[PDB]
């Protein structure tokens, strides 16, 4: 009997289990969340959930919010938090923030013209792990990633240049 990593559904079920006892807001989407972690096996989801939980309980609250599960994903997907960017000169934060907002703005303008681009989800300039900035996207169904049409590759190229 050979069984590898679970699928989106295998993942949704696991995080439904580990988060059954706890409580979550109405807005926090577990489907989109379980869709945006392709490659994890069971217990990494438990680590994500418990880190979000300790972040929320340090937050003086008990109800898990979107920011909290996002913090957990980031403590494992990216890495540990690191000291912020210096603000003595305008250059560093101006450059990195312009990178992020250019990627996000160009993605939003492309998606409103052809429809193939994803939705931008989260933009952050907080050093974390080995990067300094991040523009995250909402991943789609795997049916969308079996092919690579022409326009979709044109959009990938444009989004690589935009920053």
């Amino acid at each position: 009997i050979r069984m590898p990593k679970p699928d989106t559904e295998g993942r949704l079920e696991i995080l439904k289990l580990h988060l059954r006892n706890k409580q979550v807001a109405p807005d926090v989407d577990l489907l989109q969340l379980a869709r945006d972690l392709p490659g994890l096996v069971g217990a990494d989801l438990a680590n994500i959930v418990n880190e979000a939980a300790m972040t929320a309980v340090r937050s003086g609250r008990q109800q898990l919010t979107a920011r909290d599960i996002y913090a957990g994903v980031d403590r494992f997907t990216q890495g540990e938090v690191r000291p912020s960017l210096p603000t003595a000169h305008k250059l560093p934060v101006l450059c990195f923030a312009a990178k992020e907002i250019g990627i996000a703005l160009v993605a939003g303008e492309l998606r409103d013209r052809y429809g193939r681009v994803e939705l931008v989800e989260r933009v952050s300039i907080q050093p974390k792990g080995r990067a300094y900035s991040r523009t995250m996207f909402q991943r789609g169904t795997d049916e969308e990633y079996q092919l690579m049409t022409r326009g979709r590759l044109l959009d990938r190229i444009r989004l690589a240049l935009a920053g």
Partner: peptide, 13 residues
């Protein structure tokens, strides 16, 4: 790395 064994990493710059 599982919960309870080593749950918090702290970074020294």
């Amino acid at each position: 790395i599982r919960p309870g064994r080593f749950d918090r990493i702290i970074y020294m710059p």
